[PDB]
Design a protein around this ligand. Sequence first.
Ligand code: NI
Length: 61
Amino acid sequence: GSHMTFVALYDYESRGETDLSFKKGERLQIVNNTEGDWWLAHSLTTGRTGYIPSNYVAPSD
Ligand code: NI
């Protein structure tokens, strides 16, 4: 619900009111990773929240 950390593979610029912008390499906490194309996430560095495209991220190890 926040204990899964993913890393951005590519930069992403938000296009609407609900999606989260991020940079390649940024770490994102995933609230739920079972939801398909859009995952709800937040950055611990910027604090910002929003939906991210699930094809833009991989697990952060
Ligand atoms: Ni969690």
